[PDB]
Every structure is written in C-alpha cells, then in structure tokens.
C-alpha cells in the first residue's frame, strides 16, 4: 500500500497568490499516469478527482480553480492547487486519497488561515 511524507498542517495568508496542499507518495510504482487516481476530501464531499485512466478532472462549483499538476504525478506529487478565493471559504482538514490501481492510501492535512 501507499506511504506518504506526512505534513500535519499548512497555512496561508492574503500574501499567498495561490495556495498548495502537499501530497507525496513515497512508494509509488506506476510507469504510466493511467494507473493513478487522485481524490481530495473536505467534509465528506469529493473536492477534486483525477481519473488518470480518463485524463478527466471533476470539481464542484465552489472549487472551480482546484487542480493538480499531472506532470508531477508519476513522482508521487498529488498536491492540490487552487485559487485563494476558494481557499478562504473552505478551511479545515483535507484528505489526500491516492490510488494506484489496486493499491491505495490516504493522509490528513489541515489548511489553516492566518492574519497579520
């Protein structure tokens, strides 16, 4: 099964033009992006799903800016990227569910908002 470089929390302010949520699989084995499935959860609702077999992204209305960098996936980078407009309204624990064909794994990362 998939293992992770776990980071407990990442925080953003107004200065961050874009906010990234890390996700790093340390034991991925896929030789092709068609074998990887990526899903992000916020409160029990799927926020971003990337079906590598279909090369299709799926995001709701209030997460339109959310996407990941597919070019970095084969190295284990499943980090979520979104515009800060979508980040401020939705702050909390994020689950990064990575699927490699039959193998699976998930990690919990809290996105925190700071103010100066």
């Amino acid at each position, epitope marked *: *099964q998939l293992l992770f470089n776990k980071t407990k929390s990442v925080e953003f302010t107004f200065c961050n033009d874009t906010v990234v949520i890390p996700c790093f699989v340390t*034991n991925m*084995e896929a030789q092709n992006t068609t074998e990887v*499935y990526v*899903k992000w959860k916020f409160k029990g609702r*799927d926020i971003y*799903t990337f*079906d590598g*077999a*279909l090369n299709k992204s799926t995001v709701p209305t209030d997460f339109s800016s959310a996407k990941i960098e597919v070019s970095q996936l084969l190295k284990g980078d499943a980090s979520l990227k979104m515009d800060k407009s979508d980040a401020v309204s939705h702050t909390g624990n994020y689950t990064c569910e990575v*699927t490699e*064909l*039959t*193998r*699976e794994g998930e990690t919990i990362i809290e996105l925190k908002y700071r103010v100066v």
Partner: antibody
Amino acid sequence: QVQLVQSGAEVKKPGASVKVSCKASGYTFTSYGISWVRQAPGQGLEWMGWISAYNGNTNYAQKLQGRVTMTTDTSTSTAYMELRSLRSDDTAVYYCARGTVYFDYWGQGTLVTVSS
Amino acid sequence: EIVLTQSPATLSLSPGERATLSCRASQSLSRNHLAWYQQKPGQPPRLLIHWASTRESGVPDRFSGSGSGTDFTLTISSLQAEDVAVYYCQQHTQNTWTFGQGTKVEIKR
C-alpha cells in the same frame, strides 16, 4: 506471470479447523495487499478479509466472529487463511486475491467441505 | 456497511443484443471504488472493469462500465455465447468491502 497458487482441497468435520495457503509469484509480494473471498456452492461471492503483505495488519468480516486468522510469510511470499470451529455453513470454495480496492488476480480456489 | 443491490437477478438476451446490468449502492461511492467481475461456472472470478469504467488489458470493448454516486452499470453491447456467466460488482469504501448478489446472463435461443 502474476500467479496465486492455492493449496489443495480439504475435508473437515464440524468443530475442526482448516488452513488454506496462497503462494504468490510474479510480483513483489510485500508491495500489495491480499484479500480472501469464499463462495458456497451455487451462491454468490462473500468477502472474508484483507491482509497487508508488508505489515500483517488485517481487516476481518464481522460476521465471521473472529473465527478467521490471516497471516503472511514474506520469506516465501505466501498468504494463509485459518478458519476454526467449522460448521456446515462453511462448505465453500475459498479464494485469495491480490488487490486492496479491487482484486485483479485470483487463486484457483480451494474447496473446503464441512460435513459429519 | 455498503450494500450492493444488483438487478436483474437473471437476464436472457439473444446473441448480438445489448445487456444492461445494474448495481445500486446503499450509500454514495466514488468512481475509483467500484469494480466489475465475471465468473464462469467452475472458474475463479475474472476482473473486467476497475474504477467503474476502465476495463483490464484483454477485456473486449463490448464491456463498458458507467455510473456515479449510487448507480453503476455494466453494459455488454453485442452479447456472445462466450459471455454466459454471473457478473458481480464490488465496492471498497473506508475499510469496508462488499459484493453484489450477482446477475446471471443467459443466452436466448
């Protein structure tokens, strides 16, 4: 060349125990999970449990009531299923499978007949 | 504990016709967590489609899967005499694994 060769069929009396082995080859054994599914003659598939080939961590079907113990042997890339206190309900064909989310490779099955 | 209800229980279609097999889920499922299996009499189950739409290598394109949430479907476009089997849908969601009761596809003559 991914194969799962299962042990031969066994006949047991009610109350006895049975152990079924699942020898793996053609892939890195500890990189995947192992699941067990049984099927009574003429009925549907019944999921039994899942085991990590790397850890040994297990998830058992609740209805089995702790009558099942699953183990792995990373020295021989072999998985084991032991069911104790057998009853006539347990007469079924027992399968071992590789995946975790789904199951992409299956053993040939082991018939375990439980009768007096 | 997800329950997968599979309809219909039995299906009799003439060769060359199109079969529609349903798999209802008692709770919503993500698409990567639904898979389809084919089992011929006396043989171990054969995996057809994973992630609810992606067939395995060697699986003919006549088998296509679709659906989201609580409704998933396996479609056999041009039924062949070699497709007589029982078809099972399987889910895995948050440390739970269940199988559907299956659909037995029969050839009509």
